[PDB]
Design a protein around this ligand. Structure first.
Ligand SMILES: CCCCCCCCOCCOCCOCCOCCO
Ligand SMILES: CCCCCCCCOCCOCCOCCOCCO
Ligand SMILES: CCCCCCCCOCCOCCOCCOCCO
Ligand SMILES: CCCCCCCCOCCOCCOCCOCCO
Ligand SMILES: CCCCCCCCOCCOCCOCCOCCO
Ligand SMILES: CCCCCCCCOCCOCCOCCOCCO
Ligand SMILES: CCCCCCCCOCCOCCOCCOCCO
Ligand SMILES: CCCCCCCCOCCOCCOCCOCCO
Ligand SMILES: CCCCCCCCOCCOCCOCCOCCO
Ligand SMILES: CCCCCCCCOCCOCCOCCOCCO
Ligand SMILES: CCCCCCCCOCCOCCOCCOCCO
Ligand SMILES: CCCCCCCCOCCOCCOCCOCCO
Ligand SMILES: CCCCCCCCOCCOCCOCCOCCO
Ligand SMILES: CCCCCCCCOCCOCCOCCOCCO
Ligand SMILES: CCCCCCCCOCCOCCOCCOCCO
Ligand SMILES: CCCCCCCCOCCOCCOCCOCCO
Ligand SMILES: [Li+]
Ligand SMILES: [Li+]
Ligand SMILES: [Li+]
Ligand SMILES: [Li+]
Ligand SMILES: [Li+]
Ligand SMILES: [Li+]
Lengths: 346, 346, 346
């Protein structure tokens, strides 16, 4: 970030990046120019000796389509909050679900990883609307690395009808009232463990419009491990979900088990190779689908950091999914992808 | 605002807010997450000892819907102008209609009020496209507190056809050529009186597409009073309109009588309780409607200012409208609403 | 540009403008309020004493329509690059096609000139998606004033089908693989000559959907001249195209000859009168059209610069086109336009 303002107890940072990015793939919905930029503002005000006020907004602006194209920009984050010394912080708005406090440990690939085809707004697993989040860092300032979070999310319902809210959306991004919690900590120097749990009510449209997934509650359980020392980064996460993992355009998996593992090495001159394996296995799917792989790929790439403001990267998604009636009907890509990027960050 | 640049006669103020907001209501089109942010710039250049140039842009970015939702950001203001000593200022672009010079005195509620009796792009009552505005403060420097404005707005017509302009829109936001004037007198520190007038040609689509309201011209007459001293804020405004006030989706009221009154108290410790009453009465409505209430509510709330950069509020709109064929057919909300907000300001 | 950050080798410049603009014309698709603003950022990081990293984003935000109107903002530019001593620079993203390195010399009118009705995304003639651009200044430092560029653009295909890419668009803005080069030389102080060439594959939809133009490839050849000294600015460019110039909504011209010439004078007190002639003539058009003028007008205007941050202008497009079957079927405006603008710049 770049501090652009600091007067009379208020500071503002401007941050973002411009990513000149191209994908090469046989999947025509992914192949081609993917250039985009992100811009954001982070503010913080000293209210009193212990109390601070803050705000953050992060905007994504696509630059890979024409000036006559639609829906090219969107808000990723927008929240306001208060932090009281070591007692913790509280913020509300569009923010990350606390499941990401642990699953973010494997979200370190040069380009790929993280969100799936539909994106965020997947209960408390990624960026979400209307989350109230309490966080406590370093256990009231006493235990370095021991962090916890408690989160609540209000219902974001249908566009119209009895299940509507003002900010309605399609079944794949709807949610009822929900809660989540996360706890991360260091076992040893450079070694961390983390746990996250979430439970949300599902909506009537989620239980009637798509063909797959039925249940009143969406739940996730995650465990994660991280090694970050001696220029080596190792991370793994395992998540078991119930009615919460999308099965592409078909609905939700009644049960799913997601596993991700990554190994990276940082050379002092800037080069950072990366190798990872990601899989999401769906269980008990309806319509005779039974058990199906939803995601399965090995990732190999590298980022070269010129400095903190400039980098270049390559990433190879080695797609291990077979083409079958599930991947075709769900619209899940089975093709490999190569990404090439040049990034200026502020 | 936050001044981020001030060099070689030019200065730029970056301003905005991030409002973590939630509405509680039985009306499902209102209920839920309402988080949004505003961001703008105010620029000013000293051309010479007597001449200053200026520009302002204000953007609204909703953050309560998904990253794949449409139409989540829009420009509220965008205008450039010149100010010449005591001779006044002139600006053109998207800016407030001069009726708001007086009705803004009651637009001070913690959350509600504002675009209720006179919504956006509603002739010269609120923000408007293509307004050319001449303003004069302290009557050419000769009468302290005496301000006046003269404004002209060119036609903003239909999307296609004989009534079109490049920037066409639907009947509810159209206008023909029009003008407005306002005069406000700050007679003494904290005591003010104001008058505003507007007259616009109506369009052919406004006299055909909506179910209600017919006439060649839209006219408004406003009177206002404001007391702001001794930690107390009192204000009232009365506006009588002809073919200018919207009757929801039904069209325009042939005549309307709009009234707003507010009383607030500012405690030194930061709390600002507020009580208000707002009403808009439609008269001589066609199709058997006769006289109907378009808007009617008591507002009770409070804002707590932590400092100049952070605040929190609660607002309770006690909706006095009843569900009837007019409110149903016009799409006017008759339910109560509670708003809870946490705002970071810059 | 306004430098809002300069610390540790990283520099950020915020730039843009707010243009309070109104057009007066008998053409209802152009007549009326045209207010808009531009905002951008130019960032540069010193990686080492010879290598620099950079990025630029330019955003256009229309402010002439309502807050409920769609598609009012878009990215004009977004690219990241590396610049290394005399070896040159390389950038990738949304950037100008290298034909603009020479045609930009006539794109200096108060308001008119530049892009036509469809706008940019016209092979390498204007702003384009997915362009990889190599530039070299002063021929590796060996020939002062001799610059060149080499550019590649990957396919930007259809929305769906065999010829699709992720960022698909309509035939008017598609392209296959393309290459461009430019070369400019300052013969003497203030006198330059330039040449540019582009060759792009045309897509199957371009060769099947539109009424006019058929060919495997789009090709352009440009020569230009500029005099910029003694407060005088004269420039001209001639471009010959094959299957590259849009014939309005009808398609592309099998052959076209474009010519633009401009003359301006800068008075020390701020006034800058301007006169220009612009023509685009389609040759070998199918369906009995034969030779037709696609664009033909004289431009007379003036800009008054109060200083570097504030200006006002009047521009008069004297449209020499006649209403015929070609202009009617192609949707080409044949009407005169007068533009009046008041601009604040940062
Ligand atoms: C900011 C922390 C708030 C935690 C309150 C959780 C209330 C439980 O809601 C869960 C409903 O899901 C079933
Ligand atoms: C705020 C204080 C509480 C902090 C959170 C406590 C721990 C949250 O529980 C997380 C549950 O994680 C279980 C991990 O299991 C991974 C796979 O589980 C298989 C399903 O049983
Ligand atoms: C650190 C990640 C190393 C990559 C491991 C690849 C393992 C391949 O698994 C294929 C599973 O097929 C069943
Ligand atoms: C500009 C010359 C340097 C560009 C990098 C070399 C290109 C080869 O890339 C191989 C990357 O392999 C990454 C897997 O580890
Ligand atoms: C506009 C003329 C009517 C005068 C009303 C004045 C009311 C309050 O005056 C404030 C004087 O206090 C000193
Ligand atoms: C045409 C209007 O004629 C009505 C005259 O009534 C005068 C009311 O003016 C109100 C000014 O405040
Ligand atoms: C079908 C509805 C009735 C149409 C009658 C048209 C008469 C137009 O009169 C315009 C002038 O009257 C203005 C009256 O304003 C009185 C209130 O002024 C408020 C200022 O504080
Ligand atoms: C020059 C216009 C004078 C203002 C008169 C109209 C103001 C409307 O409010 C009057 C009623 O005051 C109610 C106070 O409670
Ligand atoms: C301070 C005493 C002066 C009172 C001013 C009287 C103004 C008379 O206005 C009549 C028009 O009323 C408009 C509102 O009508 C509502 C019914
Ligand atoms: C002379 C100036 C007097 C100022 C009047 C102050 C008005 C007092 O307002 C009380 C504020 O209390 C806010 C209560 O909001 C409750 C919302 O709760 C929702 C209930 O469902
Ligand atoms: C101060 C703004 C925080 C708003 C919290 C909203 C909680 C959602 O409740 C839904 C029932
Ligand atoms: C010394 C003045 C040069 C700039 C004057 C521009 C106006 C004269 O242009 C005449 C028409 O030329 C059309 C453009 O053709 C350029 C051909 O390129 C040849 C480069 O030597
Ligand atoms: C003030 C009206 C001037 C009209 C434009 C004339 C342009 C003359 O420029 C000639 C430069 O040589
Ligand atoms: C003062 C020199 C500017 C040149 C004006 C050209 C006007 C062209 O008129 C064509 C009308 O038909
Ligand atoms: C170097 C001076 C260029 C000025 C542009 C010419 C303006 C008048 O052109 C009239 C052309 O008429 C063609 C028919
Ligand atoms: C050199 C400046 C030339 O500007 C003249 C513009 O006037 C042309 C005549 O247009 C009349 C219609 O325009 C009405 C609004 O100005
Ligand atoms: Li289930
Ligand atoms: Li595959
Ligand atoms: Li009427
Ligand atoms: Li009610
Ligand atoms: Li051709
Ligand atoms: Li014409």
């Amino acid at each position: 970030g770049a501090e652009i303002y600091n007067k009379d107890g208020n500071k503002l940072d401007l941050y973002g990046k411009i990513d000149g990015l191209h994908y090469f793939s046989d999947d025509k919905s992914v192949d081609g120019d993917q250039t985009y930029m992100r811009v954001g503002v982070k503010g913080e005000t000293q209210i009193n000796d212990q109390l601070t006020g803050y705000g953050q907004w992060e905007y994504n602006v696509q630059a890979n389509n024409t000036e006559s194209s639609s829906d090219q920009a969107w808000t990723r984050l927008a929240f306001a909050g208060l932090k009281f010394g070591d007692a913790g912080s509280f913020d509300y708005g569009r923010n990350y679900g606390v499941v990401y406090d642990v699953t973010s440990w494997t979200d370190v690939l040069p380009e790929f990883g993280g969100d799936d085809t539909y994106g965020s707004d997947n209960f408390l697993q990624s960026r979400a609307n209307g989350v109230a989040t309490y966080r406590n860092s370093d256990f009231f300032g006493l235990v370095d690395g021991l962090n916890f979070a408690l989160q609540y999310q209000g219902k974001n319902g249908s566009v119209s009808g009895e299940g509507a809210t003002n900010n309605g959306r399609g079944w794949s991004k709807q949610n009822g009232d929900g809660f989540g919690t996360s706890l991360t900590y260091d076992i040893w120097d450079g070694i961390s463990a983390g746990f996250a749990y979430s439970h949300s009510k599902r909506t009537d449209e989620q239980n009637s419009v798509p063909a797959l997934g039925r249940g009143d509650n969406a739940e996730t359980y995650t465990g994660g491990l991280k090694y970050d020392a001696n220029n080596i980064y190792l991370a793994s996460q395992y998540t078991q979900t119930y009615n919460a993992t999308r099965a592409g355009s078909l609905g939700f998996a009644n049960k799913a088990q997601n596993f991700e593992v990554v190994a990276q090495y940082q050379f002092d001159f800037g080069l950072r190779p990366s190798v990872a394996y990601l899989q999401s296995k769906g269980k008990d799917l309806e319509r005779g689908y039974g058990d199906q792989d939803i995601l399965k790929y090995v990732d190999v790439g590298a980022t070269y950091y010129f400095n903190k403001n400039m980098s270049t990267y390559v990433d190879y998604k080695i797609n291990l999914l077979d083409d079958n009636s599930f991947t075709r009907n769900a619209g899940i890509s089975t093709d490999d992808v190569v990404a090439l990027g040049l990034v200026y960050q502020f």
